Amino acid sequence: MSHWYDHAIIYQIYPKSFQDSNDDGIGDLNGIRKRIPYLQNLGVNAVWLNPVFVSPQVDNGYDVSNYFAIDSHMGTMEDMENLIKDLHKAGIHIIMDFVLNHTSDQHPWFQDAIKNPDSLYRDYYIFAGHDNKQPNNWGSFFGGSVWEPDPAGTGQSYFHLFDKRMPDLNWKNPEVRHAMLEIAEFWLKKGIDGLRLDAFIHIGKADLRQNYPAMDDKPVIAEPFFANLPQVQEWMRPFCEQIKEDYPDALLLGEAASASVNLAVDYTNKRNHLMDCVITFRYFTSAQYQPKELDLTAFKQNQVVWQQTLADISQPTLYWNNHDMARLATRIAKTSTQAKSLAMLMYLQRGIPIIYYGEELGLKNLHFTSVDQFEDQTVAPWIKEAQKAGISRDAAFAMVSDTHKLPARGPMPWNDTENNGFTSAKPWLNGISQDDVTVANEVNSDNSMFTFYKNMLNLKKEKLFQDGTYYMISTGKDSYVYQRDLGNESAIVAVSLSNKKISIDLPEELLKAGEYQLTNGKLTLMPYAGVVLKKE
Numbered sequence: 120m121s122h123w124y125d126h127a128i129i130y131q132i133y134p135k136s137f138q139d140s141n142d143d144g145i146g147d148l149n150g151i152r153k154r155i156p157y158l159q160n161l162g163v164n165a166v167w168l169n170p171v172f173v174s175p176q177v178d179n180g181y182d183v184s185n186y187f188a189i190d191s192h193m194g195t196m197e198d199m200e201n202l203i204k205d206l207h208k209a210g211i212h213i214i215m216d217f218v219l220n221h222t223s224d225q226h227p228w229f230q231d232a233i234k235n236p237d238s239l240y241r242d243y244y245i246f247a248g249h250d251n252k253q254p255n256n257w258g259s260f261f262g263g264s265v266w267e268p269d270p271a272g273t274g275q276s277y278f279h280l281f282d283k284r285m286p287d288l289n290w291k292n293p294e295v296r297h298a299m300l301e302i303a304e305f306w307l308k309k310g311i312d313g314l315r316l317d318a319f320i321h322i323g324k325a326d327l328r329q330n331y332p333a334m335d336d337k338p339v340i341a342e343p344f345f346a347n348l349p350q351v352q353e354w355m356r357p358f359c360e361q362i363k364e365d366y367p368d369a370l371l372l373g374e375a376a377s378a379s380v381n382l383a384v385d386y387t388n389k390r391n392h393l394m395d396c397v398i399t400f401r402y403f404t405s406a407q408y409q410p411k412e413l414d415l416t417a418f419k420q421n422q423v424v425w426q427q428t429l430a431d432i433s434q435p436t437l438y439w440n441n442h443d444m445a446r447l448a449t450r451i452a453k454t455s456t457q458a459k460s461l462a463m464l465m466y467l468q469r470g471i472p473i474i475y476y477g478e479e480l481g482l483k484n485l486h487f488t489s490v491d492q493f494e495d496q497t498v499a500p501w502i503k504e505a506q507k508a509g510i511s512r513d514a515a516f517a518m519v520s521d522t523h524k525l526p527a528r529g530p531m532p533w534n535d536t537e538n539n540g541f542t543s544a545k546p547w548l549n550g551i552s553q554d555d556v557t558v559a560n561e562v563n564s565d566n567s568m569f570t571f572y573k574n575m576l577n578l579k580k581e582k583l584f585q586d587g588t589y590y591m592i593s594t595g596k597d598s599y600v601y602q603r604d605l606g607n608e609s610a611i612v613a614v615s616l617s618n619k620k621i622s623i624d625l626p627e628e629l630l631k632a633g634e635y636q637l638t639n640g641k642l643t644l645m646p647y648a649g650v651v652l653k654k655e
């Protein structure tokens with residue numbers, strides 16, 4: 120059999136910034152329903168929306184306090200059932216972020232164990248200790264220890280791998296494993312078509328009695344003790360198999376952020392009955408907020424390694440930018456021409472494109488003043504360093520605004536009405552919006568970024584670019600170039616990464632996507648440009 124997701128094309132929405140439909144300045148699900156026409160015109164066949172479960176919003180809703188309802192700002196279960204009905208009527212699927220490693224301190228289960236030390240929900244989380252002592256030196260990704268002495272408070276301590284308020288689930292206890300399955304099945308019965316299984320690599324944690332020998336004696340971020348353990352695969356296996364059995368058209372898409380490529384195999388290999396695909400973070404490359412310079416050859420090695428090592432097994436995921444990173448323009452594009460060229464570069468390879476909302480319009484990071492807006496701690500102390508450097512106030516803010524995750528959640532600019540018709544009230548975030556793009560301007564203008572992605576996406580649907588093999592061409596270190604072939608038919612994508620015009624040796628030759636080039640047999644590309652050439 121073949122399933123809908125084999126020929127998938129995914130549009131990621133951070134729904135707080137997509138469309139506000141009740142004038143609170145916060146985007147909602149009814150907003151997204153209003154803009155289904157826009158999505159069809161772009162040609163995306165699936166929407167992955169960010170978490171929308173009831174949640175304290177301590178960490179963009181991945182700190183979940185109730186999987187069975189729906190955050191009040193976003194709307195009502197009625198709205199969500201209708202969104203998944205409307206999208207299905209437009210031939211569009213939907214997939215949700217579902218986090219398997221932790222809940223919030225607010226989840227009923229944790230609230231039972233924090234208040235009853237004799238509760239059976241103490242086993243649903245990870246508790247150990249003597250007299251507010253940490254039983255080992257493991258350190259969280261968010262700072263200090265993974266341990267937090269319980270409020271209950273017996274002089275034990277509960278495990279959190281991230282923030283103190285996001286306690287980890289004990290996957291050893293099979294009562295959690297069924298429960299998480301029940302959450303997944305619940306949503307699949309609603310008719311959501313897949314699920315982004317988040318932080319799943321961390322369900323496995325070592326023998327708690329062990330320490331990691333370190334710098335000493337500060338608690339240490341010991342990935343080996345709580346990432347990619349054999350337990351991960353054995354606990355996921357029945358979880359995945361059960362989902363598949365009952366909902367076989369369901370996409371199970373993993374987050375293996377910075378996992379081994381050999382691990383991406385383990386998680387995606389059909390033999391192991393786990394995941395269909397995996398997002399990886401390994402594609403890419405005062406201290407810490409200085410504008411990023413992509414190590415361009417390193418990108419080429421990883422892009423090839425991944426396309427190659429996964430050729431026989433699984434589709435790679437194809438993405439540029441995100442809700443947790445600076446947008447494409449800003450972070451890496453130098454021009455409208457390169458923005459187009461890069462999208463081409465990445466997405467016409469073998470895989471499933473995941474394109475971030477607003478990337479298609481060629482949006483940039485918002486750019487703004489005041490630490491508060493950032494919802495981040497390190498920005499204040501970091502700006503002080505550059506100021507000492509004597510980089511202007513203006514310039515210091517810019518640098519951080521051009522590198523930080525949060526400026527990449529700008530509201531969609533849809534039109535020329537107030538707040539670009541995103542809302543009517545104060546939008547939940549706003550700043551400079553440097554510089555002004557709107558969907559009205561780009562849906563008409565066939566020169567625009569949008570029209571390029573539209574045409575680019577219709578090409579991607581073709582049997583050549585969906586199912587064909589991939590082979591990266593011998594390297595202009597200047598330029599990214601590769602070939603896609605069905606065996607019967609064949610085409611070459613070629614993209615300039617130089618600001619000076621450059622030349623390419625290749626066979627012969629029909630064009631479809633492209634932005635200014637030469638025709639002889641040898642090929643010359645205008646600066647940062649690129650073209651798709653079908654052979655004979």
Ligand SMILES: [Ca+2]
Binds near residue numbers: 142144147192
């Ligand atoms: Ca709203």
